[PDB]
Every structure is written in C-alpha cells, then in structure tokens.
Amino acid sequence: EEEFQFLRCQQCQAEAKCPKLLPCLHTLCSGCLEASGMQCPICQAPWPLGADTPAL
C-alpha cells in the first residue's frame, strides 16, 4: 500500500481528478479525455500493459 490512495495520469504525470481507462488499455486523466478528446498519448511508446484501473 501507499501513503496516498490516488491515481496518476501516465500522460500528464500529475494528479488525476477523474481518470479513465482508454479503449487502448491506457490510463489518462479527466481533463485529458475532454481536452485530448479521449486521445491516445500513452500510445507514443509500447508500454507494458496489464495494469489499468480507475481511482478509489
């Protein structure tokens, strides 16, 4: 467990208020979905999948 129970945008590298699991198995923040219109920034590199869940 960690001192904090929150997520972190893998594309913004900051606190995610309302992050979501993109259709490409990626983790983005709320603002990213609205701003990036559900884009695919994490698709920039073949990152290791298998871990993608919402915030507590």
Query: Interface residues with Zn ion (CB under 5 A)?
Result: 9, 11-12, 24, 28-29, 32, 40, 43
Judge contact between 52 and 26, C-beta under 8 A: yes
> In this complex, which beta carbon is closest to Zn ion, that of residue 5 or of residue 44?
44
Q: How far is the CB of 11 from Zn ion (least distance, A)?
A: 5
18 is in an annotated binding site: no
> In this complex, which beta carbon is closest to Zn ion, that of residue 1 or of residue 46?
46
Question: CA-CA distance, 24 to 15, in Å (whole number)?
Answer: 21
Question: CA-CA distance, 54 to 46, in Å (whole number)?
Answer: 21
